[PDB]
A paper describes a structure:
We set out to design proteins that can switch between two well-defined and fully structured conformations. We reasoned that these goals could be collectively achieved with a “hinge”-like design in which two rigid domains move relative to each other while remaining individually folded. Designing one of the resulting conformations to bind to a target effector couples the conformational equilibrium with target binding.
For example, cs074 (site pair 1) showed a clear peak between 40 and 50 Å in absence of the peptide, and a peak between 30 and 40 Å in presence of the peptide, and both peaks agree well with the corresponding simulations (top row). In a control experiment using the static parent DHR protein of design cs074, the distance distributions with and without peptide were identical and matched both the simulation for the parent design model, which closely resembles state X, and the experimental distance distribution for state X of cs074. FP based titrations and kinetic characterization using the unlabeled extended hinge cs074F in excess over the TAMRA-labeled peptide cs074B agree well with the corresponding FRET experiments, further supporting the pre-equilibrium model.
Author numbering:
A (entry chain A): 2 to 230
B (entry chain B): 239 to 261
The structure:
Amino acid sequence: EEVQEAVERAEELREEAEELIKKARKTGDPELLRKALEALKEAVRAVKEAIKRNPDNEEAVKTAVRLARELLKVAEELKERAEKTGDPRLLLLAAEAIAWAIEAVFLAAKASENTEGALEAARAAVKLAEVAKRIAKLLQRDAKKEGDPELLKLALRALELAVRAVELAIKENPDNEEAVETAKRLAEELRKVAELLEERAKETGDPELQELAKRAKEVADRARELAKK
Amino acid sequence: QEAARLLELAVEDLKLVLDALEK
């Protein structure tokens, strides 16, 4: 019953995000792709709430697979529009659409007891982690070259989802050194962004720059816990 | 469940797109 309502509510948001992509393809607003992304993310939270308390529900497993395909459609167009504009911001949104696609495929593969694809989803999360790190390395250059405080926040957000990516692969297999090394690589990159945030904060004050400079070091602690363990 | 091979291409597609931003 409750699982049925969560699956239905998840399908309501997927078809709604499906029409936003078709509208976004017609020379659409990147916000239309973000609105489709936000709708799909909440839909993934619905099937997660549905797979929990009732796994192996083929309707919930099928719905989780349909979300992963629709999440890649947002990621597909976000990569294309990021290659035209050259904006690393769209590369961040594209990496988020893949991240939730990794979760959606990891939920269904683990629920259907498909160790074949469940371990494959964990390996792709490690590959996505090194992408979000390079995306963060790119947002650090444009935040220094073009001088934008927003780009340093997005650089941290790129590393925060990169830590969540290796957190998914470590939970499945803690003895994966490529995910362990990447966690060590993300930890040191988080301290670089934290030094960038604190320096610019000392020059301009501002509570946000100080708060995110503290959050960057605290995310580096979680990634350091993932690395040493 | 073939999305497992489809997603690893998406993370690899973003690799080449990210690396293509140099030009």
